[PDB]
Enzyme design. Structure first.
Site, PDB file in Angstrom:
ATOM      1  N   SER A   9     -10.770  -9.498   3.564  1.00  0.00           N
ATOM      2  CA  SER A   9     -11.299 -11.034   3.300  1.00  0.00           C
ATOM      3  C   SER A   9     -11.890 -11.484   4.553  1.00  0.00           C
ATOM      4  O   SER A   9     -11.074 -11.586   5.474  1.00  0.00           O
ATOM      5  CB  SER A   9     -10.140 -11.795   2.675  1.00  0.00           C
ATOM      6  OG  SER A   9      -9.554 -11.219   1.459  1.00  0.00           O
ATOM      7  N   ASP A  33      -7.388 -14.018  -4.842  1.00  0.00           N
ATOM      8  CA  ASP A  33      -8.003 -13.093  -3.766  1.00  0.00           C
ATOM      9  C   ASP A  33      -6.612 -12.374  -3.434  1.00  0.00           C
ATOM     10  O   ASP A  33      -6.074 -12.606  -2.325  1.00  0.00           O
ATOM     11  CB  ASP A  33      -8.721 -13.747  -2.660  1.00  0.00           C
ATOM     12  CG  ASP A  33      -9.126 -12.601  -1.754  1.00  0.00           C
ATOM     13  OD1 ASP A  33      -9.164 -11.509  -2.004  1.00  0.00           O
ATOM     14  OD2 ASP A  33      -9.577 -12.849  -0.423  1.00  0.00           O
ATOM     15  N   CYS A  52      -4.063 -16.569  -1.953  1.00  0.00           N
ATOM     16  CA  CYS A  52      -4.861 -15.460  -1.419  1.00  0.00           C
ATOM     17  C   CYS A  52      -3.443 -14.886  -1.005  1.00  0.00           C
ATOM     18  O   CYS A  52      -2.759 -15.505  -0.449  1.00  0.00           O
ATOM     19  CB  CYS A  52      -5.669 -15.644  -0.541  1.00  0.00           C
ATOM     20  SG  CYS A  52      -6.437 -14.192   0.489  1.00  0.00           S
ATOM     21  N   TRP A  92      -4.020  -8.883  -3.480  1.00  0.00           N
ATOM     22  CA  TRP A  92      -3.952  -7.480  -3.505  1.00  0.00           C
ATOM     23  C   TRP A  92      -2.524  -6.829  -3.117  1.00  0.00           C
ATOM     24  O   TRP A  92      -1.805  -7.807  -2.849  1.00  0.00           O
ATOM     25  CB  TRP A  92      -5.080  -6.840  -2.234  1.00  0.00           C
ATOM     26  CG  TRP A  92      -4.468  -7.357  -0.691  1.00  0.00           C
ATOM     27  CD1 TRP A  92      -3.623  -6.769   0.123  1.00  0.00           C
ATOM     28  CD2 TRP A  92      -5.006  -8.615  -0.155  1.00  0.00           C
ATOM     29  NE1 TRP A  92      -3.474  -7.736   1.177  1.00  0.00           N
ATOM     30  CE2 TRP A  92      -4.285  -8.569   1.105  1.00  0.00           C
ATOM     31  CE3 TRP A  92      -5.923  -9.428  -0.381  1.00  0.00           C
ATOM     32  CZ2 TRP A  92      -4.462  -9.690   2.108  1.00  0.00           C
ATOM     33  CZ3 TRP A  92      -6.182 -10.602   0.463  1.00  0.00           C
ATOM     34  CH2 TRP A  92      -5.240 -10.709   1.621  1.00  0.00           C
TER      35      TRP A  92
HETATM   36  C1  LIG Z   1     -10.077  -7.189  -2.216  1.00  0.00           C
HETATM   37  C2  LIG Z   1      -9.011  -6.990  -1.015  1.00  0.00           C
HETATM   38  C3  LIG Z   1      -8.884  -7.863   0.000  1.00  0.00           C
HETATM   39  C4  LIG Z   1      -7.919  -7.467   0.859  1.00  0.00           C
HETATM   40  N1  LIG Z   1      -8.027  -8.371   2.087  1.00  0.00           N
HETATM   41  C5  LIG Z   1      -7.466  -8.016   3.168  1.00  0.00           C
HETATM   42  C6  LIG Z   1      -7.251  -8.692   4.112  1.00  0.00           C
HETATM   43  O1  LIG Z   1      -7.864  -9.725   4.416  1.00  0.00           O
HETATM   44  N2  LIG Z   1      -6.281  -8.556   5.338  1.00  0.00           N
HETATM   45  C7  LIG Z   1      -5.632  -7.416   5.115  1.00  0.00           C
HETATM   46  O2  LIG Z   1      -4.625  -7.185   6.081  1.00  0.00           O
HETATM   47  N3  LIG Z   1      -5.502  -6.335   4.229  1.00  0.00           N
HETATM   48  C8  LIG Z   1      -6.464  -6.759   3.078  1.00  0.00           C
HETATM   49  N4  LIG Z   1      -6.713  -6.016   2.047  1.00  0.00           N
HETATM   50  C9  LIG Z   1      -5.730  -4.709   1.877  1.00  0.00           C
HETATM   51  C10 LIG Z   1      -6.709  -3.478   2.677  1.00  0.00           C
HETATM   52  O3  LIG Z   1      -7.956  -3.238   2.081  1.00  0.00           O
HETATM   53  C11 LIG Z   1      -6.041  -2.311   3.058  1.00  0.00           C
HETATM   54  O4  LIG Z   1      -5.488  -1.776   1.631  1.00  0.00           O
HETATM   55  C12 LIG Z   1      -4.754  -2.460   3.935  1.00  0.00           C
HETATM   56  O5  LIG Z   1      -5.575  -2.843   5.192  1.00  0.00           O
HETATM   57  C13 LIG Z   1      -4.272  -1.043   4.222  1.00  0.00           C
HETATM   58  O6  LIG Z   1      -5.324   0.096   4.573  1.00  0.00           O
HETATM   59  P1  LIG Z   1      -4.870   1.201   5.624  1.00  0.00           P
HETATM   60  O7  LIG Z   1      -6.067   2.047   5.326  1.00  0.00           O
HETATM   61  O8  LIG Z   1      -4.537   0.638   6.900  1.00  0.00           O
HETATM   62  O9  LIG Z   1      -3.621   1.869   4.970  1.00  0.00           O
HETATM   63  P2  LIG Z   1      -3.497   2.940   3.884  1.00  0.00           P
HETATM   64  O10 LIG Z   1      -3.598   4.194   4.592  1.00  0.00           O
HETATM   65  O11 LIG Z   1      -4.730   2.777   2.934  1.00  0.00           O
HETATM   66  O12 LIG Z   1      -2.332   3.194   3.174  1.00  0.00           O
HETATM   67  C14 LIG Z   1      -1.843   1.785   2.395  1.00  0.00           C
HETATM   68  C15 LIG Z   1      -0.861   2.453   1.431  1.00  0.00           C
HETATM   69  O13 LIG Z   1       0.383   2.462   2.175  1.00  0.00           O
HETATM   70  C16 LIG Z   1       1.525   2.452   1.326  1.00  0.00           C
HETATM   71  N5  LIG Z   1       2.564   1.453   2.028  1.00  0.00           N
HETATM   72  C17 LIG Z   1       2.266   0.369   3.031  1.00  0.00           C
HETATM   73  N6  LIG Z   1       3.730   0.211   3.267  1.00  0.00           N
HETATM   74  C18 LIG Z   1       4.629   1.125   2.738  1.00  0.00           C
HETATM   75  C19 LIG Z   1       5.799   1.119   2.865  1.00  0.00           C
HETATM   76  N7  LIG Z   1       6.343   0.219   3.712  1.00  0.00           N
HETATM   77  N8  LIG Z   1       6.614   1.693   2.091  1.00  0.00           N
HETATM   78  C20 LIG Z   1       6.075   2.673   1.106  1.00  0.00           C
HETATM   79  N9  LIG Z   1       4.664   2.750   1.133  1.00  0.00           N
HETATM   80  C21 LIG Z   1       3.969   1.777   1.755  1.00  0.00           C
HETATM   81  C22 LIG Z   1       1.138   1.870   0.017  1.00  0.00           C
HETATM   82  O14 LIG Z   1       0.847   2.615  -0.900  1.00  0.00           O
HETATM   83  C23 LIG Z   1      -0.257   1.017   0.448  1.00  0.00           C
HETATM   84  O15 LIG Z   1      -1.143   1.147  -0.640  1.00  0.00           O
HETATM   85  C24 LIG Z   1      -7.411  -6.279   0.867  1.00  0.00           C
HETATM   86  C25 LIG Z   1      -7.638  -5.592   0.141  1.00  0.00           C
HETATM   87  C26 LIG Z   1      -8.217  -5.710  -1.247  1.00  0.00           C
HETATM   88  C27 LIG Z   1      -8.553  -4.992  -2.331  1.00  0.00           C
END
Ligand SMILES: Cc1cc2nc3c(=O)[nH]c(=O)nc-3n(C[C@H](O)[C@H](O)[C@H](O)COP(=O)(O)OP(=O)(O)OC[C@H]3O[C@@H](n4cnc5c(N)ncnc54)[C@H](O)[C@@H]3O)c2cc1C
Ligand SMILES: NC(=O)c1ccc[n+]([C@@H]2O[C@H](COP(=O)([O-])OP(=O)(O)OC[C@H]3O[C@@H](n4cnc5c(N)ncnc54)[C@H](OP(=O)(O)O)[C@@H]3O)[C@@H](O)[C@H]2O)c1
Ligand SMILES: Cc1cc2nc3c(=O)[nH]c(=O)nc-3n(C[C@H](O)[C@H](O)[C@H](O)COP(=O)(O)O)c2cc1C
Length: 608
Positions: free
Chosen positions: A391, A605, A560, A607
């Site tokens: 966001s 907003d 949010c 997620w």
């Molecule tokens: C519309 C929208 C807006 C968003 N806005 C923001 C924002 O503003 N700020 C922000 O920080 N994120 C936001 N996100 C989330 C962001 O898009 C990512 O999903 C997040 O940052 C994690 O991405 P990553 O690639 O670092 O982790 P990834 O490698 O994608 O891994 C994420 C996955 O790790 C797993 N996981 C996380 N913790 C654990 C746990 N403790 N135990 C077991 N499984 C776990 C879950 O399956 C999670 O889905 C938003 C998402 C959407 C869809």
């Protein structure tokens, strides 16, 4: 608008296909389900193709009956996905007669969300209204429990239903490759992909407009730690979009294409005994398909595993099913083979050992040491690496040439025994402002927006990283006041664990409050006392005033953050406020709030 491909029916006729599976997908889940269903067709003496409805005119569905034993399947996820808009608008509009058309729909949703599988239900309902005949019941996959399993259950009943109706036989086939491997010993480095998404060298030679197919490489001008303590790592990044021609508004999202951890990529290559620097291409064995490759080719395995493939999420059941053939220990081949079961120990093992334990491909290769598949087939099986959305934490009225990001770095202990790292956040965290740190991105327009009139009251609820868009909202309301505009009340309901641990934007918020940009700065410190204190406890505390703003002041409510529990608890608190001051019964209070969302005065907003 997109330039449509020629009739999909004619294409099916020319290629001997009788089934076409359309995917409405945003993050590639429905797309992979469609691909799996399309591939299944072969196992039953049929032939199918998977297709993006946006590239076609679905009006040609009326011609589908011209193909004997024809059938169309729709794998639709809800958010109507961008690629399903044309199809959606078409469904509502047309009066075309689909008599003779046979269909089935599988919806991908999530119950923690308002409109659960709305798209899936609409499509299935509309096709019938138009005259088509359902060949199998609508599927309702719930990503809050386990979507993969709901698909498995549906799929297992779908095919026999299809074979029975068309009188075709179930047979059980050996592994089939979709792509062929071509190794390139002689190649001009100028033609080898190195991580770009669209045109070759598009990352090096940037040309607007910039979007998902052609991301803009924005320079990271700032990357600072937001939280005060060391329990976790929360960060603030500023991406320079000068000269990109990119437009945005507070409330929009910014997507980024990350790079996987190099060490993880290196270990996969090492454990498979493969040379990751081999330059090659995986070419579709179906020369008619527009999908020439599974990802940009030619490229090296290293580049593919780094920028194009998802190597961190738990592998889906079909991937493990196809890998089983490469496990030389019978017990391991059996475990992998049974991961695709719709019941029993195989299913339970998949849910606990793979999904719950969050085992990624390397972990599985390590824990089932007999599993040594060839690198090229693995690359063909792995899902594509997706962009991550954030966001935008800034107002374009104040920072027209910079997009800010507020994010929590993901790093947790998995029951698999290893520490799992979030792809995008680990990569973003390592970006150091400068041979300068570039982040491939693009902006996605949302409907999360401040009121049109400056005088309209605003109620923002965003604990933790849910504060993100509101930093922009506040910057903008402050700007309006500076511009001589009459600004209504602006209330922020924020929450964190402790003021001295993770109070995001503490100083910035204090300033906006001091200057009057924030009418009220209500912060719930959840861990500063024995009992939890959350934003909804503050909303309940201020119920009388909030009702006044909502019912008499036409205030806009914004929520949010956490979609799992926070969003629902906050919504429930709003139901209670309305119920008490309407006054009205709970049921009427719910309709009241649901109406606010339709009328654009209650925006989300969230997620998970
Ligand atoms: C519309 C929208 C807006 C968003 N806005 C923001 C924002 O503003 N700020 C922000 O920080 N994120 C936001 N996100 C989330 C962001 O898009 C990512 O999903 C997040 O940052 C994690 O991405 P990553 O690639 O670092 O982790 P990834 O490698 O994608 O891994 C994420 C996955 O790790 C797993 N996981 C996380 N913790 C654990 C746990 N403790 N135990 C077991 N499984 C776990 C879950 O399956 C999670 O889905 C938003 C998402 C959407 C869809
Ligand atoms: O995600 P993130 O990492 O950005 O945030 P986060 O730090 O996990 O959560 C932000 C704040 O929201 C609180 N919270 C937890 N559950 C809530 C709920 N059900 N309703 C309202 N607030 C809740 C958290 O308190 P606790 O974490 O102390 O519950 C914390 O104070
Ligand atoms: C921002 C966001 C909004 C969502 N909104 C809904 C929704 O309104 N209804 C629903 O049933 N599922 C909703 N979901 C869940 C998705 O429909 C579900 O995760 C689906 O499996 C995603 O498929 P895809 O990867 O093919 O896009 C949402 C997910 C995100 C990330």
């Amino acid at each position: 608008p997109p330039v449509k491909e020629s009739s999909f029916v004619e294409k099916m006729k020319k290629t001997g296909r009788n089934i076409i599976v359309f995917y409405g997908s945003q993050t590639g889940t429905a797309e992979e389900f469609a691909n799996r269903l399309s591939k299944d067709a072969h196992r039953y003496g049929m032939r199918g193709m998977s297709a993006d409805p946006e590239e076609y005119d679905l009006a040609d569905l009326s011609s589908l009956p011209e193909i004997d034993k024809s059938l169309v399947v729709f794998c639709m996820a809800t958010y109507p996905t961008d690629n399903a808009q044309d199809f959606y608008d078409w469904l509502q509009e047309t009066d075309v007669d689909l008599t003779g058309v046979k269909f089935a729909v599988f919806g991908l949703g999530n119950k923690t969300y308002e409109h659960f599988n709305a798209m899936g239900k609409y499509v299935d309902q509309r096709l019938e209204q138009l005259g088509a005949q359902r060949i199998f019941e609508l599927g309702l996959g719930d990503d809050d429990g386990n979507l993969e399993e709901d698909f498995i259950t549906w799929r297992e009943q779908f095919w026999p239903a299809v074979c029975e109706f068309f009188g075709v036989e179930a047979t059980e086939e050996s592994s089939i490759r979709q792509y062929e491997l071509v190794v390139h010993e002689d190649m001009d480095v100028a033609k080898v992909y190195t991580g770009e998404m669209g045109r070759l060298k598009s990352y090096e030679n940037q040309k607007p407009p910039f979007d998902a197919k052609n991301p803009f490489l924005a320079a990271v001008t700032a990357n600072r730690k937001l939280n005060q303590g060391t329990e976790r790592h929360l960060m603030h990044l500023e991406l320079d979009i000068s000269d990109s021609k990119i437009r945005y508004e507070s409330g929009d999202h910014v997507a980024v294409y990350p790079a996987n951890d190099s060490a993880l990529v290196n270990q996969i290559g090492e454990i498979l005994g493969a040379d990751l620097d081999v330059i090659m291409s995986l070419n579709n064995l179906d020369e008619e398909s527009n999908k020439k490759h599974p990802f940009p080719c030619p490229t090296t395995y290293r580049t593919a595993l780094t920028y194009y493939l998802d190597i961190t999420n738990p592998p889906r059941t079909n991937v493990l099913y196809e890998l089983a053939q490469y496990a030389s220990e019978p017990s391991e081949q059996e475990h992998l083979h049974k991961m695709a079961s719709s019941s029993g120990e195989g299913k339970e093992l998949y849910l606990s050992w793979v999904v719950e334990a969050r085992r990624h491909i390397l972990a599985i290769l390590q824990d089932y040491p007999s599993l040594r598949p060839p690198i090229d087939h693995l690359c063909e099986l792995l899902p594509r690496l997706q962009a991550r959305y954030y966001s935008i934490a800034s107002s374009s009225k104040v920072h027209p040439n910079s997009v800010h990001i507020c994010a929590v770095a993901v790093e947790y202990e998995a029951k698999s025994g290893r520490v799992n790292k979030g792809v995008a956040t680990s990569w973003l965290r390592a970006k150091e402002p400068a041979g300068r740190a570039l982040v491939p991105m693009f902006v996605r327009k949302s409907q999360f927006r401040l009121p049109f009139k400056s005088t309209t009251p605003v109620i923002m609820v965003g604990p933790g990283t849910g504060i993100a868009p509101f930093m922009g909202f506040i910057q903008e309301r402050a700007w309006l006041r500076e511009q001589g505009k009459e600004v209504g009340e602006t209330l922020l309901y924020y929450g964190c664990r402790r003021s001295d641990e993770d109070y995001l934007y503490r100083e910035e918020l204090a300033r906006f409050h001091k200057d009057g940009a924030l009418t009220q700065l209500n912060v719930a410190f959840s861990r500063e006392q024995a009992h939890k204190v959350y934003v909804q406890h503050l909303l309940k505390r201020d119920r009388e005033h909030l009702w006044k703003l909502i019912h008499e002041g036409g205030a806009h409510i914004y929520v949010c953050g956490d979609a799992r529990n926070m969003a629902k608890d906050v919504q429930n608190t709003f139901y209670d406020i309305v119920a008490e001051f309407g006054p009205m019964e709970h049921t009427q209070a719910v309709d009241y709030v649901k109406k606010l969302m339709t009328k654009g005065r209650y925006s989300l907003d969230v997620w998970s």
